[PDB]
Write a protein that binds this DNA or RNA. Sequence first.
DNA 1: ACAGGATGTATATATCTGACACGTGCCTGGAGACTAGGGAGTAATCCCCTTGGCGGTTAAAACGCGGGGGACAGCGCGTACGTGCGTTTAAGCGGTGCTAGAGCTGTCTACGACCAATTGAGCGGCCTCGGCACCGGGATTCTCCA
DNA 2: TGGAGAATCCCGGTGCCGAGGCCGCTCAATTGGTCGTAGACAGCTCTAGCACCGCTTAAACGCACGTACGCGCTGTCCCCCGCGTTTTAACCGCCAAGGGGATTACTCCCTAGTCTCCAGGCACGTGTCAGATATATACATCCTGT
Lengths: 105, 106, 98, 98, 86, 81, 656, 95, 93
Amino acid sequence: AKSRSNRAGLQFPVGRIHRLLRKGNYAERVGAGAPVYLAAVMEYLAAEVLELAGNAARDNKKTRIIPRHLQLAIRNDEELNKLLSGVTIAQGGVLPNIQAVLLPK
Amino acid sequence: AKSRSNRAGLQFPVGRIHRLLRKGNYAERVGAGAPVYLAAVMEYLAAEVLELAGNAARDNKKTRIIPRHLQLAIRNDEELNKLLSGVTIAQGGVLPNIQAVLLPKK
Amino acid sequence: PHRYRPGTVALREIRRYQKSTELLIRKLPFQRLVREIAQDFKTDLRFQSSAVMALQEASEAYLVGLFEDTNLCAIHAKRVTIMPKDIQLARRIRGERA
Amino acid sequence: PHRYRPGTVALREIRRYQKSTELLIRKLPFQRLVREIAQDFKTDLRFQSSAVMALQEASEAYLVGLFEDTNLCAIHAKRVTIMPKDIQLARRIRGERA
Amino acid sequence: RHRKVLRDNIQGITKPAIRRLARRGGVKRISGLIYEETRGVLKVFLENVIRDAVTYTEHAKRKTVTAMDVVYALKRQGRTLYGFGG
Amino acid sequence: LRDNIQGITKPAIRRLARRGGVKRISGLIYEETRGVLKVFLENVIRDAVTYTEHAKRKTVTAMDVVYALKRQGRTLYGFGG
Amino acid sequence: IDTAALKEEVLKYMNRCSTQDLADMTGCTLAEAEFMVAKRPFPDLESALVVKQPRPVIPKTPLGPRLVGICMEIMRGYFVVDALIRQCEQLGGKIQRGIEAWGLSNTATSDEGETSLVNFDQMKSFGTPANSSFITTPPASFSPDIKLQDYQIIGINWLYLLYELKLAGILADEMGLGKTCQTIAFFSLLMDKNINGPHLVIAPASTMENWLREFAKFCPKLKIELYYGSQVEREEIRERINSNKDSYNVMLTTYRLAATSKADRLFLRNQKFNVCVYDEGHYLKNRASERYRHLMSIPADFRVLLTGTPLQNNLKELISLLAFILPHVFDYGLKSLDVIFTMKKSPESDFERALLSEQRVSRAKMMMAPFVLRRKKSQVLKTRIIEFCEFSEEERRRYDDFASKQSVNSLLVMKTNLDTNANLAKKKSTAGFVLVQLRKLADHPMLFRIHYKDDILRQMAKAIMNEPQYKKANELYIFEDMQYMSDIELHNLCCKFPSINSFQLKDEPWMDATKVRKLKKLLTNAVENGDRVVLFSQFTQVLDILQLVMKSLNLKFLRFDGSTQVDFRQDLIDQFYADESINVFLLSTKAGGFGINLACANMVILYDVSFNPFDDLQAEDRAHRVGQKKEVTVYKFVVKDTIEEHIQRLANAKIA
Amino acid sequence: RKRKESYAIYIYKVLKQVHPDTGISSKAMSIMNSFVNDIFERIAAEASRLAHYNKRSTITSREIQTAVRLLLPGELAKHAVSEGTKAVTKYTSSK
Amino acid sequence: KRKESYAIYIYKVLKQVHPDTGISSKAMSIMNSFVNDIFERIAAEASRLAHYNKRSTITSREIQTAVRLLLPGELAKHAVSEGTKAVTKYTSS
DNA sequence: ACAGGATGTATATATCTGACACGTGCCTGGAGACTAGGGAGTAATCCCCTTGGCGGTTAAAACGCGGGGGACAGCGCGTACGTGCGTTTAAGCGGTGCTAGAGCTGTCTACGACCAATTGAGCGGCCTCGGCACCGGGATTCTCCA
DNA sequence: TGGAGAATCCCGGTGCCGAGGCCGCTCAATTGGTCGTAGACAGCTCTAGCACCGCTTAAACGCACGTACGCGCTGTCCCCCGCGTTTTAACCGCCAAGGGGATTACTCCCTAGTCTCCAGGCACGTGTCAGATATATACATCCTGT
């Protein structure tokens, strides 16, 4: 039995998305070729934050991805940041940012 | 041949509301009381905005409610304002608001 | 002849334009702006005659909702004139230039 | 003995606290505040031990998102200190005291 | 005299217009370099709603921008506009 | 003894703005933000109980706080859902 | 109206009518009209009432009650068409009885829809009888320095005999035959009879100036009221008339001013004009409009139309003219013809091609004939010459490769598009540019890009920056702004504005044309005598060419454009008829063709010929009189085998 | 064939129930045909989450009664919940 | 007792991008929240898109509209070339 | 201005240590087949609504000029807040205990999907009379200079 | 220092157009069964959460001080409001096509729905290793004097 994500060439369980997209009441009918497209954009988006995370965790000289690496990953990007504009994060804090008039005279 | 809204004794059409929750995909099952309760709260809400408009258009002695009276009604009350804070009204304009520092010689 | 005090004519236009409700940008300069950014985005597009009308009051109520807001910053700096750092403060707080 | 320059210790705490990520309000004063407004709203309520934890970082990231914002207004008035008219400007633009 | 051919329409929002516009929003006196900045602000506002309402109509397999899609494009930002059929 | 609203203590907000990058604070800020925080909680803890009110539970869970903070516009990650 | 006779006229209709004649009256589709007549013959309306299209098989009004519902209203309004035609038949014969009371001949048949009273040479020879109402001599209040022709003597008493009978007239002579010169004379003949107004002339802003010129020129005793200016200026005009310190016989307005302001609407209603003259009342052609009601709401004891169009085969035109000429029918309800006029023409149906309606269009034209006075050119003849020009190799070398740049390889090959566009590639054809460009190849060939192709305009670009023409960075925009202008114009911004003068003259290439060396023949048609000429030219760049073809041979002084449409022109037209200092005043198609000039300028020359009969004759009768003292001849320029010759009619005739 | 639904006559109705002496321009009535359509859109969107959160498939009166406290501000919602529990009670005894 | 998540799949991608990188379980909870926000925010649009044009189905086209609509453009540019590339591998089966 | 002590900070190693990682059973969720049936292609149609052109107005932009007023700038001065020490105190750690109750299975059932015919409520349209815009005339009122 | 002068509110009048009522009509709400399952409840548990309660120590609390920043005053001039002349380009109306819009008829295929299957994925159980943290340790940075 060839799995649907493997014939799509992905990792995300497209059966799980196809099971959720029926019961989530987003329509009364969902195309078979629909949630394969949703699995790809999810596996793209989960990769793209995480690739920028593992860049930042590399700079902190650690192997473990920690929530401090996440918030510094998302805010440092611009285009990702506007997606997660109003979105907060847990345990993340804020990017280091000094305003210009804060330095002493 | 009594309507369910007539059996509610109310004036927003409760039948097509119960039809709207069927094809709006909001859930799979709708209770009997759910569109009845929803038509009541629209009857309370759509009156409460319209009650403030009718007192507003009475000030300028206009029988026709112009939406300028309507937008003046909603933002003047502070509680209805928080319902529609991110909403504009067509032909709406703004409330009379000049800050005090812009006024002439005291 | 007689010239008014400066600002006092401008204050009269506040009470003239707060009580009135007509549209404040001419239609055809607004419409020809819209079609320019249209075929920049995708070409061969026509518009419904009321579709630009809502698009106008979208922008106009947005621009009043900016200008009435950016007036509050210029008051807060103890001035009575807006400057391009005042409007730059406005979208930074609102969620554009964060 | 030796006293530092004023502000310069405070500037060190900026770089100490921007690089760190721990919670900045003690848990038990935050928790006993929560239960007070709870039975004010409806009584006989218990809390999950992680439920107040997310509630903390809800408020704390909101308070940083206010304070980092209200710093921008005090800069805009050519000062370096915030005053209660600065934070009063912040929620007025953001959409509370409009 | 065919010298703007779909370019200088950002100058169509003229300097008296934004002069007129801030009077409704209640600004007392305007500095002279404001007009160029709000030209950029307004255009980057339109470059979202035209971006969205095209994508609706381009999904609608048709080319005429209708009315309610603008309201649906304006919903995607969170600026609901009324009085246009929804 | 002490007020729980005064449990949010004056060194804490002073420590808080240092994360936000404010150099020097006025002493009147400490009794303003206490109003700002408490009006913030009376939205979210209003919403937080009403989910548990709907579930007919007598305990507040963490998952409801997210479902409270979702319709606030202040959506928050890292806690499930 | 008889409902029992109404239900019989639909019974004879439905059993008889063809499928296309069913849809032409009803507006329905071809399948429903066939399905209606598939069940027919119909002995009664109830046998038609059971017609319904069947329900769709398994793979909100029925067809009967719909079609019998509309055709009953069609037969209702048909009798109202008859109730208007038969009433128009009444006053129509009285005009003919008034025309036969002159003892004058009519060369027009009633089925033409016109009357055509040419001349009264039998009344000139034997005298005017004692019972005739005709006035052979021009009115004394008219200017005696201007002669009115014998057909122009007819029309003012054609207006006057129609003025007696309490009607509305249509002086529908072709334009340029002095229709404006008669109505000023009709105002002067009314001045002879102590009927001194107030009259209204609604003439558009393109002809607000010809009348005010000829008001001074043809009847200077006639008191003119100019109701024109700004809104607050006309308010002072309205106060100038509401405080009656000066009586006027004549008020002049446009179609613009008369209807868009309520203030003018209550003003003109409060003037109560005697005669109203409708100069190009094309709103009277469209009955279903706000403007047409606005045209007729203003009171007038005598309503006159001035338009050179004959009565066409269009019942939407004719019924709109039937309410005009017949009094107290505009005051009638007219609720039975809105159904007649609301069927918009379609690919499927048209109300003009209905069989019962087509018999009524002939029936409406037959009775509207003594109300329409149209005299043709050749019935009162301006000897016509059509002088073809020889070819020149300069015109021909761009004419003969215009069988290649015109013939795009797209029709009679298919480009790849999104969907199966079977006829959009047909609908991108018949573009009007290449026809008028072929009608510009036949014109003066200098207007094309034959002089300064690409590189001479770069030298203009650097040598126009050395001026106050110095913007931010405009070396490749002004040059591109100079890439689309014509070579006469790219000469005309380097001769009128001397910023660059190295290539202003190109060895005078305006003299190198087949139409100008034949005009050099026409120039030598102006050297044996004082032949001051009328030179029409269809195009403005052609006028900008022809202003400078006179910059070589004989001096150019005044380019007589048709863009003088703001106020009355005199100084363009009065200082003329001298020997050679003022010889060539270049008329144009965009000039006002309602009015004319002095008849001494005999040879009228057309540089370009026409496509439709809207200006086939207006450019061709400015010196057309019956009392000219010398030889008078109209000219038009035609080239070898261009389509400018092929818009002139040479294909074939019909034998019937 | 062309047909379109609205709420206008019912709003025009609720006007005469509270004010017999008022007219509405059609552009003003189109606000209320949108304004009640936004409010109906939001409260259904609340219950769709709320029915999903207790993993139910139904929508009863309790979900909407939860929702109208959740969405509307306090005092407006305070009459509004009583404006419904009175109204379904008249629906309760009838039939 | 039974709960379901994405925690094996997130880590999966992680090791197929950064094979030499650990991840805390708190950071896993961010990602499992991050998936169920983006999946939540997309399907609300695809419902409403088909609701606007009255299609009773959710297909590949509407999600393609929402990803051009919801996410910004350069993020939209790669994503629209991702799933179309992904469904083409799905197509030949 | 440079020196330098004082203070702070990353380095680097060493030692926990628990949290991440793999592994293993297990099961339920997902894949494959099949089928209805209807939702959508689609192609045709047709009618409308858009748009492109033209003209003709004229309110409206626009350019300029002046002047005066708000903005910046500098000064002063003083206050209230940083900054460190010392003292208090309670936050937190980590146990302890208890117990509502949250979450779970189990059982009916009662309410709502469903389809059918029913039948009138609403909706498209068409009048029509009156609110409302104008508008000009008319008395009032603020605002600038004595 | 009140009196002039621009803008204003009030109003009679016109009138107009459009909201509004009458009517047809239609299709969709309502009624009425009938099925079944989704939810209500009864029960249980165990667990997570409450609360004691003592220790402790970091942090809060309190305090001098000084100094800087903040608020104020004066000044200055630069800039933009205010009106006037010009002009333009918007508004307006019409008149076009005409191609895009919406509808229907028609099919189809594709996707819900059911069943079977079976392993992919999960709860839990280990383990080790990154990582947190002391701690020397050298090294950077601000502080003030000469």
